[PDB]
Amino acid sequence: TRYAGKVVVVTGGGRGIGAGIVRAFVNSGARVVICDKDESGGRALEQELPGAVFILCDVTQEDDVKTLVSETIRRFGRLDCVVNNAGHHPPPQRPEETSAQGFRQLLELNLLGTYTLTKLALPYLRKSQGNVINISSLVGAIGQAQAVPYVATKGAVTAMTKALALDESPYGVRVNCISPGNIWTPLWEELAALMPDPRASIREGMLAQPLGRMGQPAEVGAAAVFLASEANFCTGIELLVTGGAELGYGAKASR
Amino acid sequence: TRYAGKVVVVTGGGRGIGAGIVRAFVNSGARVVICDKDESGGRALEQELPGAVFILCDVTQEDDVKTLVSETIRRFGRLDCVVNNAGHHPPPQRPEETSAQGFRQLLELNLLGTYTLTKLALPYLRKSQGNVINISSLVGAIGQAQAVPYVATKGAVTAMTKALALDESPYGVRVNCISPGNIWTPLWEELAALMPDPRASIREGMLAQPLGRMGQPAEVGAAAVFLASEANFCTGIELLVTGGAELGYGAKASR
Amino acid sequence: TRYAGKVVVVTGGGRGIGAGIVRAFVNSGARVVICDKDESGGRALEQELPGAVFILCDVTQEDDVKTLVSETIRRFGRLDCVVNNAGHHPPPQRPEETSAQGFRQLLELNLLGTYTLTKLALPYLRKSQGNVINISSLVGAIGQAQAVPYVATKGAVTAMTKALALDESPYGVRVNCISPGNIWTPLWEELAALMPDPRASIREGMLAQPLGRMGQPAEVGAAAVFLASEANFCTGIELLVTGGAELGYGAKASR
Amino acid sequence: TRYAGKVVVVTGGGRGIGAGIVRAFVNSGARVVICDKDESGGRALEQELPGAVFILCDVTQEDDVKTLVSETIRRFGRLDCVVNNAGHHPPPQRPEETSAQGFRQLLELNLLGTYTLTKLALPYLRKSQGNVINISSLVGAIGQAQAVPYVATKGAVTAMTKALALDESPYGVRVNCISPGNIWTPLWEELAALMPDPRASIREGMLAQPLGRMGQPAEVGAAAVFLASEANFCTGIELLVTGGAELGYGAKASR
Numbered sequence A, B, C, D: 001t002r003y004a005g006k007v008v009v010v011t012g013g014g015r016g017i018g019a020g021i022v023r024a025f026v027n028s029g030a031r032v033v034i035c036d037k038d039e040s041g042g043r044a045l046e047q048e049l050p051g052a053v054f055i056l057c058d059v060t061q062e063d064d065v066k067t068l069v070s071e072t073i074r075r076f077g078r079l080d081c082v083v084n085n086a087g088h089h090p091p092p093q094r095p096e097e098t099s100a101q102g103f104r105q106l107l108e109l110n111l112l113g114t115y116t117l118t119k120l121a122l123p124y125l126r127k128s129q130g131n132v133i134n135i136s137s138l139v140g141a142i143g144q145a146q147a148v149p150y151v152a153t154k155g156a157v158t159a160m161t162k163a164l165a166l167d168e169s170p171y172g173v174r175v176n177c178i179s180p181g182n183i184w185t186p187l188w189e190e191l192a193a194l195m196p197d198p199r200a201s202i203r204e205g206m207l208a209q210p211l212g213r214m215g216q217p218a219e220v221g222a223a224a225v226f227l228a229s230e231a232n233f234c235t236g237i238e239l240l241v242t243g244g245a246e247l248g249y250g251a252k253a254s255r
Ligand SMILES: NC(=O)c1ccc[n+]([C@@H]2O[C@H](COP(=O)([O-])OP(=O)(O)OC[C@H]3O[C@@H](n4cnc5c(N)ncnc54)[C@H](O)[C@@H]3O)[C@@H](O)[C@H]2O)c1
Pocket: A011, A012, A013, A014, A015, A016, A017, A018, A035, A036, A037, A038, A041, A057, A058, A059, A060, A085, A086, A087, A088, A089, A109, A113, A135, A136, A137, A138, A179, A180, A181, A182, A183, A184, A185, A186, A187, A188
């Protein structure tokens, strides 16, 4: 009932954090459009959840995004909230191992895809006095080792959130972001499998938080529903969902 | 239903932000103990709200706080959440107009009262895996003019929140704070009446936010219920409820 | 004498903040390579300053940057510090007036040009235990109105600074950034001339700081010399040179 | 020569960080008044350094501080900079092991002593357009385990710095703070000796920084001289001198 009658688009909603956000909004009473470039997860989610439908869309293709917005309006008549969750973390890479072309490609997904959907949705969000929620990362704020391009893209997302909150405030459209820490998702599982010692890498990821565990997609989802439905005086904020990983001293050097 | 079966203590809950927090938790299904040093507002609130009871308590008197905790346990059998909201903003004061004794007295209310209740409640919060919510202020983070002692007390509250989150994480007790901006409350009304031009001071307070209005106590209350009931991976965070006042450039000099 | 015997590259050093940084390092005893895509300012600066030489280089062209580094080594035998100052602020633009292609182009200058020079210089900086200084902006941290692409590029620069500081710490190479506020430069003068009321826009820019004035290029230059020569325990920091613009409340809404 | 003709007061200047700051200002050309409550270190420093003199003063005693200011003026004719460095870190203490009276006493030293000297010096700093430098701590910003009162006092110092910067900006008096991380000092040595395994505790303190070492008092001193002599557009800033300890993920839980 908390967000009943509202219409929500979630990008990258087929698995992981995105799927947790989809479930949270459905459980809140909203109708949800699942955007994803992969069919398998999103199509099953649509079969599972009444009130969720899947639309195939690669957020780096402007025509895909144009079609995503116009199909949402044609099928549901309004748009109240856009959750820009689609993104990717490459394998760990030393700075000298990165390239400018890989950096550009990551900017297309993590940053320009967020920019494009937000721009095309804003005319409808103004009509509904809706809101924008970007999924950024704690490492945009504190940095990360072996991830120069990834960290740069999330620093941009968090900053862009504040700029757009300023521009859209006169229209009553709020723009906020969530900065998760280590959340246990298929990407976390995939990247750990490439590590020399997968079990050790997962152990270290759980101990990076004072709480002693990683986060869950449903916990990012609850934060998103809060920002959409009950945070009417919040705009341009960065909501940390990190288990306290940024607090206090810890071992940062190995020698 | 979101916080049903839980028991919550709110200090300074008789009016203003505190009363908005009380109402939010009652509406969530919790039983609420209203702490306040003044009887008038809190006693009426208890008559109004089933599930809220008023206990007279000055948070700067350690024996008052000891009695507040033991009465809560005797009457309700558990304690799940402590909201440290009691505090005060003195009239604007130039630095040379402040005194060390006024500074100490403000520290007793805004900082040591929060410390004392939290310490006495933590044995019961550990049993329930409960949580602590401190009401700090945006001006602890960005400063404020003519308010050296006030700003110092809120900088301490925000920092203390993070230290205690680290100590209590091994026990599953989360410690978070909310940093409101300009919220329209009886204190805001009282301080504006002392100004040379009350209507001008209220106009300026509304324009300090890109959203063009002040916040409401119910909006701080919704943030508190989120932190208590649905933010299980959030500890040591500072949740801004400010209407965007910290964003972008604005006129800060007068000459 | 503070940085005698050292070799410094400053991008965009032909005018504005960049030229102030060049002068500061020359006055500290360093030899300075002035990089710029425009010949007029940088060539005169080389004639004016013993110990500074001008190399024509567009930082968005990878071959230009490759040649800049190899010419620096061929002519001076070492490289101790890279100051990534080249960048641009477009005229104010509403979000719906921006384009993805303009956003990409601004990313090439403000972000990828910084990335490219840093990458090509790091082998020589490791030999000298040198350091990197990026010129970011306060608006990366607090946002700005009518500047979504600009703000995003500076959020990325600040975040990238921290990521690279982590990767290069094992080699003793420090990576820091400076975040200036309103600095009076030819770009500030040019953008103000496009405003409906140039004199009013300059007045407002001076009042945005509690200090009541804009900053000067020489003040950014002194901060850069500090980071290069005397901040041996500073890495991944963001040094604010803003006149206090981020402090306290100010008028942010117009209605 | 950088700060020649200027007069500087440094509290707690007899050993540790304070003594490093004293040496840095003497080497810059300034005359320095060493304030300390202990005679041994400060008296030897006065014998060692031409241009430094020792004045016995406990910053928690208001009459001591009154005498410190009037003796500085009587002997040197002006006052340009006050460095509030005097402070203390108690042994690690669980929250339930702390007391309100110990908390109050620590507030007297770390916070109210800074407030008192600053207030009494400001009339002379306005005449000279001088500046204030408070020595805070990184743990005011990120928290620390087993240090609730200490962390609270430093959160207050950092916030107070910004409030006072706002009040004093119309008079051209700048107010800044330095937030050091782990600096190797006699207090660090003393606290490590109380640990179950002193050598292990020192090893862990060095590895808490990506740079792999602790900081030195002379490095805090260089930051202070920068803020006094060359940071004319810097007010209300928090200058981190931490070796990057706040950057990236590290092990924060033990189980
Ligand atoms: N996992 C973490 O610990 C963590 C931490 C902080 C932030 N994040 C962020 O959260 C978001 C989700 O991460 P995750 O761990 O759930 O990842 P994930 O890989 O498990 O899921 C991402 C989903 O997005 C989809 N997607 C990828 N590219 C797309 C495109 N071009 N168009 C549309 N959909 C696309 C994928 O198909 C997939 O379903 C990302 O933005 C990530 O950076 C993750």
